[PDB]
Amino acid sequence: TIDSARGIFPNTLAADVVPATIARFSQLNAEDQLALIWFASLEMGKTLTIAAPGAASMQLAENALKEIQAMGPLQQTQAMCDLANRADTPLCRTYASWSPNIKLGFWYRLGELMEQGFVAPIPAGYQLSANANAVLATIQGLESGQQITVLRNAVVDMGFIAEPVVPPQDTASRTKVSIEGVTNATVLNYMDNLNANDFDTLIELFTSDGALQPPFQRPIVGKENVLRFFREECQNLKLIPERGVTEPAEDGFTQIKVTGKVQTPWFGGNVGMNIAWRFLLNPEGKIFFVAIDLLASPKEL
Amino acid sequence: TIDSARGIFPNTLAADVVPATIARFSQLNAEDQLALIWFASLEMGKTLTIAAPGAASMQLAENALKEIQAMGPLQQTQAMCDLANRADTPLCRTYASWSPNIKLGFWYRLGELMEQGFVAPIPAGYQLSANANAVLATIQGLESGQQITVLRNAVVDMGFRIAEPVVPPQDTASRTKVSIEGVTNATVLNYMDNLNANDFDTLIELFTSDGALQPPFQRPIVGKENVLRFFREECQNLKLIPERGVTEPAEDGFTQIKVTGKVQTPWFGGNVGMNIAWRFLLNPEGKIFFVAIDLLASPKEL
Ligand SMILES: CC1=C(/C=C/C(C)=C/C=C/C(C)=C/C=C/C=C(C)/C=C/C=C(C)/C=C/C2=C(C)C(=O)CCC2(C)C)C(C)(C)CCC1
Ligand SMILES: CC1=C(/C=C/C(C)=C/C=C/C(C)=C/C=C/C=C(C)/C=C/C=C(C)/C=C/C2=C(C)C(=O)CCC2(C)C)C(C)(C)CCC1
């Protein structure tokens, strides 16, 4: 079973504080949510700078952005609350149709306009609720890797269409990773092809019924689904695995675990996220299941 | 706005450790989830015993319970994993159609059969994962009030509208009235009294047509039709025991009232007193536009 494979290398300690904090955040009042994120990014931006959104991304979020700017300050803040409350709204429906990167670039743009004053800002001297206060304190106590994940997910969870697929990296321009302990070809091809945005080659590593499980999400099942996931969300990452361990599995399978770091194009090398990959390969070396964990600490490798 | 009303009495500290812990639980392996609940249940049972499920409830879950028993051990544990993983399954679909009380009684009965051996039990000596172990430690460090809420919610979230029969409102002469230090408000007192009497028809009349009720850690349930369905499906045989409250003016001639006290669920009777806050937003005529029910972080929140 795919669902059973979810339990390989059960010693792996994932940072479940992330979804735990996201759950707390979700309980909050809409204006409190917006205020909290404002407060958090304002303080993170002091040391971490967000990569400017892509051109195609901006073009796609341009209509919604203009519409909000045309609104009066009241309607502006009301439309932001709608996004936050996951209200049924034309704006929220369009927002929901966006890929994570477009949603992110959408809010990236609102944040500038708010600081400039052209869009209704978080009220001045605004005070967070008792609960909201605690949630922000928890966030600020987190590793940057976990901080940005918490923010990314809170944004993706709002609302009620993706970027263009960049061409695979030129073959001669590609680099190969090395993993202490792991020479397995599937694992190595996985890493290399993903770093080269070669999703077409990547997907061929999977079994037809194979699954990929992103951090704190359910397994994405089937080649069609996994490939869409690659094309919509997994562009321009930098996988930097370090060590791995190789073990036999039931029915002639092989389970491999690799730990290392990953970089998002949104923050580049300024935020190195601690990641574990858990592979379950069939006898022919096909990926039946691969899980990506955000690790609790560097103490997880 | 209903969603804006969600922010009344903002300094009220709710036990968001509950949904946080539920979020951690959900990340877990299906088998680790079942084992964890088994472990927590087995330890809680030491000092807190669960009330037996209702007869009507049992009859309603009887078919599903039978089917699972007829299965071989392997298929039994697999069906249990389906529920946990929220797999798309005829069983899960039937489970999903049930009211929380029926789901709960369903599992109540499975647990007896497992302890008796008639249904495949949690593998002996089984070891929880790193993450699963932590989640159990957090649960065991919680107040019983928050422990049972965590378990209730984990169960309700399983599967992929069948409900118990509505009990008759308590005889009018037999009804008690609550008292609340500082609060003589008629709506508030009627709310408490009618609920304790299972008189939902009278109770629902206190709401504005577009009024909402927000259960702990849930979104506002909006509209008299929806709220009343909620009353009939989930809110029978509660015991509300408010203690004090504070009354304040609100925008547009409204009035916001906050009441703190305890609540008892028929599942545990007086063995678990939950710390609860009520936050009312009443319109000029005294209709409930919004009422939120919070599980409080600590007795220090009363
Ligand atoms: C909201 C809001 C505002 C704006 C907030 C902004 C602007 C926040 C921007 C946050 C961003 C920029 C977050 C970026 C997160 C990036 C992440 C978390 C990347 C993680 C990638 C991973 C870990 C991928 C791992 C993978 C691996 C390695 C595989 O092996 C397979 C594929 C895959 C699974 C993908 C303001 C302030 C105005 C206030 C009002 C409301
Ligand atoms: C799973 C599982 C198993 C069985 C587990 C079982 C059997 C667990 C049973 C637990 C139960 C029985 C918990 C019950 C909790 C009930 C609660 C938490 C009630 C709280 C009610 C409140 C707070 C309502 C407040 C209200 C107020 C006062 C209002 O003003 C308006 C209405 C409302 C909002 C309703 C075993 C072990 C075999 C292992 C395998 C898997």
From Swiss-Prot, chain B:
GO biological process: light absorption
Cofactor binding, per record: Binds 1 carotenoid molecule per subunit (3'-hydroxyechinenone is the physiological carotenoid, echinenone (70%), 3'-hydroxyechinenone (16%) or zeaxanthin (14%) were all detected in overexpressed, crystallized protein), makes contacts with both domains of the whole protein. Upon RCP generation the carotenoid translocates 12 Angstroms into the N-terminal domain, altering its binding and photochemical properties.
Annotated residues for binding of echinenone: 31-41, 77-80, 104-114, 122-126, 148-158, 191, 235-240, 263-274, 278
Effect upon mutating residue 31 to A: Alters carotenoid specificity, <40% quenching, decreases stability of OCP-R, accelerates OCP-R to OCP-O reversion
Gene Ontology CC: one annotated term: phycobilisome
Membrane topology: Peripheral membrane protein
Subcellular location: Cellular thylakoid membrane
Presence of keyword Lipid metabolism: no
Post-translational modification (record): Proteolytically cleaved into a red 16.7 kDa form named red carotenoid-binding protein (RCP) which lacks 15 residues from the N-terminus and approximately 150 residues from the C-terminus.
Primary location class: membrane
Needed cofactors: 3'-hydroxyechinenone
A GO MF label: photoreceptor activity
Result, substituting residue 81 to A: <40% quenching, decreases stability of OCP-R, accelerates OCP-R to OCP-O reversion
Protein's UniProt keywords contain Thylakoid: yes
Keyword list, A-Z: Antenna complex, Chromophore, Membrane, Photoreceptor protein, Phycobilisome, Receptor, Sensory transduction, Thylakoid
Result, substituting residue 123 to V: <40% quenching, decreases stability of OCP-R, accelerates OCP-R to OCP-O reversion
Induction text: Transcribed from its own promoter, it may also be cotranscribed with downstream frp.
InterPro entries: NTF2-like_dom_sf (IPR032710), NTF2_dom (IPR002075), Orange_carotenoid-bd_N (IPR015233), Orange_carotenoid-bd_N_sf (IPR036917)
Free-text comment about domains: Binds FRP via the C-terminal domain (residues 170-317). Upon RCP generation the carotenoid translocates 12 Angstroms into the N-terminal domain, altering its binding and photochemical properties.
Entry similarity comment: Belongs to the orange carotenoid-binding protein family.
Main function: Acts as a blue-light photoreceptor and photo-protectant. Essential for inhibiting damaged induced by excess blue-green light via a process known as non-photochemical quenching (NPQ). In the dark or dim light the stable inactive form (OCP-O) is orange, upon illumination with blue-green light it converts to a metastable active red form (OCP-R), inducing energy dissipation, quenching cellular fluorescence via NPQ. One OCP-R molecule is sufficient to quench 1 phycobilisome. More OCP-R accumulates under high-light and low temperature; in the dark OCP-R spontaneously reverts to OCP-O.
Quaternary context: Monomer. Interacts with the APC core of the phycobilisome (PB), probably at a ratio of 1:1 in a light-independent manner; possibly only OCP-R binds to PBs. Interacts with FRP. Detachment from PBs is accelerated by FPR.
Protein name (Swiss-Prot/TrEMBL): Orange carotenoid-binding protein
Organism annotation: Synechocystis sp. (strain ATCC 27184 / PCC 6803 / Kazusa)
